[PDB]
Design a protein around this nucleic acid. Sequence first.
RNA 1: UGUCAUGCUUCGCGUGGAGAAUGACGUAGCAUGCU
RNA 2: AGCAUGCUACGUCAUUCUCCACGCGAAGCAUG
Lengths: 929, 73, 113, 185, 187
Amino acid sequence: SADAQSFLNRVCGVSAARLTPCGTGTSTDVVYRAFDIYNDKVAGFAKFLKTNCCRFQEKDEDDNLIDSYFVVKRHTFSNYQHEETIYNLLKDCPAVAKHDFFKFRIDGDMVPHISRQRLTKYTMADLVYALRHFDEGNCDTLKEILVTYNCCDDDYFNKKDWYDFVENPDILRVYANLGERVRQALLKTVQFCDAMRNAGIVGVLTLDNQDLNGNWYDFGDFIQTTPGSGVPVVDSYYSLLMPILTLTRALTAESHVDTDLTKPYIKWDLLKYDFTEERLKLFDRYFKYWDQTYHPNCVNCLDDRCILHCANFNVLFSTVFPPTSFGPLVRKIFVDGVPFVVSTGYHFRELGVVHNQDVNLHSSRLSFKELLVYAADPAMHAASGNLLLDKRTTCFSVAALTNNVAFQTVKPGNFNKDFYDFAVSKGFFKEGSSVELKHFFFAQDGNAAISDYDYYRYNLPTMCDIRQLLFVVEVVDKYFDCYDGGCINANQVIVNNLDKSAGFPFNKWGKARLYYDSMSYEDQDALFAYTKRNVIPTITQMNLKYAISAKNRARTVAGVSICSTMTNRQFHQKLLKSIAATRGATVVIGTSKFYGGWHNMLKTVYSDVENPHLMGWDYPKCDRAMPNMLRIMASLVLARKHTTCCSLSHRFYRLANECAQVLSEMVMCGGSLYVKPGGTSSGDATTAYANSVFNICQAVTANVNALLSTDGNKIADKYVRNLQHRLYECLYRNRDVDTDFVNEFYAYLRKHFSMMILSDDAVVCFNSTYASQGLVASIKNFKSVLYYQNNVFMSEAKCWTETDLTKGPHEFCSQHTMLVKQGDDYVYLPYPDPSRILGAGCFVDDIVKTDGTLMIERFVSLAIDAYPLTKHPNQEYADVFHLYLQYIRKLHDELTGHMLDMYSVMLTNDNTSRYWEPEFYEAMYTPHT
Amino acid sequence: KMSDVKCTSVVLLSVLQQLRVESSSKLWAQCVQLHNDILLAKDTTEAFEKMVSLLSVLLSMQGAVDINKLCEE
Amino acid sequence: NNELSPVALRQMSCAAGTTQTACTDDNALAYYNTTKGGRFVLALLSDLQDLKWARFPKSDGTGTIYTELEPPCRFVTDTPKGPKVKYLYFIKGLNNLNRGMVLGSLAATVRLQ
Amino acid sequence: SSLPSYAAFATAQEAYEQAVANGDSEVVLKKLKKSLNVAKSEFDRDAAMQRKLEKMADQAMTQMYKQARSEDKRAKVTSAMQTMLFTMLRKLDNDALNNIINNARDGCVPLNIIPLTTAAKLMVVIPDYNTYKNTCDGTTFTYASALWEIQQVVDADSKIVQLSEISMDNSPNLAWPLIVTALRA
Amino acid sequence: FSSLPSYAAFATAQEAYEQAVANGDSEVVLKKLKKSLNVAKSEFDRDAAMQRKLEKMADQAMTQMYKQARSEDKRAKVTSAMQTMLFTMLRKLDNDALNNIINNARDGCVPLNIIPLTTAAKLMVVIPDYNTYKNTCDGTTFTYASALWEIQQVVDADSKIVQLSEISMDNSPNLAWPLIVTALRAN
RNA sequence: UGUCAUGCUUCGCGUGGAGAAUGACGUAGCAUGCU
RNA sequence: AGCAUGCUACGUCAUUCUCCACGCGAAGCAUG
Ligand SMILES: Nc1nc2c(ncn2[C@@H]2O[C@H](COP(=O)(O)OP(O)(O)=S)[C@@H](O)[C@H]2O)c(=O)[nH]1
Ligand SMILES: Nc1nc2c(ncn2[C@@H]2O[C@H](COP(=O)(O)OP(O)(O)=S)[C@@H](O)[C@H]2O)c(=O)[nH]1
Ligand SMILES: [Mg+2]
Ligand SMILES: [Zn+2]
Ligand SMILES: [Zn+2]
């Protein structure tokens, strides 16, 4: 305590600060902190261990510690000179922490020291790392950051799920208490940049050189040039920080007057729909030194790689403006000298203002196409309707189209007593058996359809890291390059079922057949051509489902209009029909499990992976919680097949139409028009394929995050150590696409991470010795990526792993796998849940299905599904297939006995003897066909 | 006897729905709650209590069904 | 440790003029790196202040590319016999990182005062 | 077989028996073979036509049976459900269900849903003295295999009758439809 | 086309064999009558096949024509229905407030979401519980969207009329929620 | 009120190949007529 | 020997069923 007190007094300086010894200067301190690093050896945003610093903590009067630290260091004589010279230029900035340079005597040597004064304990890199790599079992840093700034108390974490966005929505509020601080940082950084440019300093701004007040304190890698011409490089700062700006709602002080949280809100003109100037002001205030050009309206964008860039900022800035200014833009026209109200534009929260190019005032007469277009849009349905204030939901309600509110209910379900009695007589449904009933028809009351719609409160505005998304999009476009696409004519479109509903209002006059036969090919082609330079809003109708399930939750489906589907088929069907005809790809839509398809799919997935393991995951609230940026991305990769048939403007207007009538639109729920925030619509023509694109995007993002957050000084393999140094450059320092590295990363992902994707279901075979070392994604990385990019917490109870590959996936498409012996060779076969089959047998959804003699095809199909259970070690599983065969025999006997009594004819020609013999069902799982 | 009550509840709620109990929101809500609670029950005594409540709902409506004829069949 | 790009640069000698026309040969020095598919001219050093265009020789048949230029910035070098004043123009539409590369390399090469 | 034109295909067949015999007279055997082939083809054609007829007839019969049974199922969907419900309820053989069903059959139905809580209001309609005799014994009321505590009893006309009154001695003195309120014990 | 050649030539075709029955001799005429009968039979077969094909073609053409003509009398009905719907909706617009808001706009464009707010003549409020009713629609007159609304009627989820005096804390458990209240814009 | 895709089973009407049978023109063996 | 007729064999055109390949309708089951 002889030299130690001398050093303490030295550090105290002349600032009149009372310092306690936290870590002695002579005996320094070490910590574990998140750093952004790029030298010629390592590169990444990862959590390392520091030594060099020695910290002292300031105690305020009354002997109480506060959040002020003096951080002394020991520097070599050269960096000392460099840093002092660079600081003597920036000292005047209000966003630069005070420094103190002094030499001290240690072991008979003069050692320099640089002391920074009054720094918060953590930095902004720690905050970003904590919220971007989330593990609920290790949240010490995040908890301390939240508690220190009065975001919550320390008793808030004794709750069940204090971090779950779905179980505990209030957590959002907690995070929103970090907004102002973040915003203040975004201001100070700009000041710093200005100072740099005025002083002639060139350097890279990183997150870990700014504390949580907003002071900058590291100048070791800066250089000097002529005054007045500096260059701050800000690409990995803003990009890494982007997902945090929307989670903590950093720009909520822009809604008040004079940008002060105490003053009231701004009252905007109710007729104002154009906010281009405000968007430019916001961009120039918070992102002044962001190089790439920003277009408030995405009509003027240049590529599909620019629409994402600009739509990110539009997503950020649209939270500041009133919610009543987004939607169709209405105008008054005259037809036959009578006024009409029609849509002639659209104000997208993510794409800006769009105006139709073909607007015709003073019309004379309307043809079938014009009547269809004018009756499809919600202009005159909402204009000529009552006002609505629905307090049961938090979704913007537009209007009420009638004088009543409809309350729709679901019915119980029917009981097939004869089959149940037969099964009971066969020794089923006893006490303590392994096969029982779990799937029933659940009933619902009148409030089902609106309570189901109120789950769109899980869709939140999610800004994305753009420099990373622009790389993931290029790596995802290689999974779709063995297909072909383009536009077809009205002659080449295939419609499977023409007896389906045509949405609203078209369902009041006929089915989908009424409009395909009343509309010549010229009419359909003209409508499709019209949609390429105009925006046609439509209305989707929400309906309840009547189906068997194991859960007490209602299910809804969204039926889209006929104008949407008619023109989406001519745009996407050529590619969608080619994705479903390819065998051996990552996406396995269109492949069957019969005649040896399951075995082929599993063998293709296994491929040649070393130390293989199998994993599978699930997406919580998939359709509801999907962000609006990944859906736009999914639609943009699917439209890259139109390079020759469509120009840039045609492609943009197709994107605008898809957004206006699928992504965000007006929904008809009980006779009232509400506004849909976002997500996915079940009834659109590209649901499964968009879900597949989204799945692959999330998996690739998980892999990138896994690889870039590893030390890099410990990756023994030298190829995988350069593949990480080059990935950081391709993300945060390369601007244009590097075509020779997306191929290398794609091959790397294909050899060590094999995927099998079908809509939102996925199975993965991965190299186990690379995952435990952090070189390929794990389940923790998926949980981390679903938190900041999907606003959802994925629990490690719906995800499964399998270390033995002779047992197959635990589940894929609700089927289990079994390795059976089938004629001299072993093969993987699928089998279902026996309770599902028995429930399908027992409970039917129509009274006419409870007469077996009329329904023998039902049981043939069910036995086809239930055959693979015959080969199960458990004996109560193999006795479901035999039950079905015996019941088929009984039904045939009854039918024959009835035909002889009611009539006098014995059905002369019969071949039904094959249905109750087990050789008819084996052929469905044998490879010959 | 669990798999017997789980089917008797289905038949009973169908019978109630045919008598047009759907025309009262409160009664239909209570019946739906009971019916969906019997189908997710792992204990038999709870299922029997809820069956008693639902059958009382059925028996309140005197003129809807002729119990004497049905019980003498 | 997040350093500026270590990439070094190479010199070319070219010319330019005030407008699309009037371009006169051998009156500017361009900086480039060829590690890309070809040569990318990153910036232009000259002695005059009225330049507003650049005619760089294109590696194609009868190809002449006219790249636009930004406003000047005045630097004082001292490598030759004594102090000299030269103006720098950055190719319009050049991200900040390549500007940092060019400025760092040039400032290291010449003291710049 | 047994078709009207089938006989020829057999007669010539018998002639084929003679074709082998008699040392296979070339001219006779060949002309007979030609006629036999013609007859066989004619009979085969007629048989095919009959088979087509039979297929059509069977399809028609199946369609008619389907329609009849579908209409039958859709017509009787009210008596069948109730009969099934009561068959199943009798098979279950519970105590509470049988108690309440018997009381309902004798006219003592409830007025609200039976509450499954320690303290809840249950109202029942005792029609006659006899149901009162059997169910209530003092200040307790046994229903649905549970004990309830009478808190009030009301007559057909709004009136607060007292337990002391309601006995055989004064059985005819009150309008009989008797509402009884009770709380679960 | 096939009936005529049959009924004409088959007479001679069978007369050829009738002559064989008459004679018995003329074994050469056996082959000659073979030729005659087979020629007539084959020519018939050909013509009859052509006739049957033509009949099927004509039947299919007639069916196609009928189906087409039935798909053009349903285009007209749907056209008329759409026009009637559009005119019915049009005649329900108060062209006094609507014109005011459309004319106060800069270029005539206005967002759709504001048209019901500023021009609608009726309001519907759907209230789940009693606290919401107390805090939103309490009294016989309230304020929403910078305007004054007067309660015109209240009904429950069964479409039964509810009096404003029945909506109290004590009687709340005896109502069928939610309550739908329809109100009229005050002047 | 009853959406988008994919797979499989059953029944019914239509087009193109191969096997068996019946009828006219060409080539081979034997017999009769003209020479 | 040449031509014609008769008997027995091989090569092209019209019908009768029998199996495959391919289209259009109707019903049903399963999956996301
Ligand atoms: N704000 C603050 N930071 C601290 C503290 N203790 C350790 N650190 C870490 O120390 C670095 C500063 O180092 P400096 O800027 O001089 O250069 P360098 O070490 O990064 S190289 C930061 O990045 C932090 O992670 C503390 O109490 N407060
Ligand atoms: N059109 C249609 N789509 C369906 C249906 N079932 C499921 N999906 C789609 O499959 C994904 C996962 O389903 P979801 O996240 O909702 O959870 P789940 O337990 O029902 S599988 C969602 O993107 C859904 O759009 C359906 O019937 N019709
Ligand atoms: Mg640092
Ligand atoms: Zn742009
Ligand atoms: Zn195209």
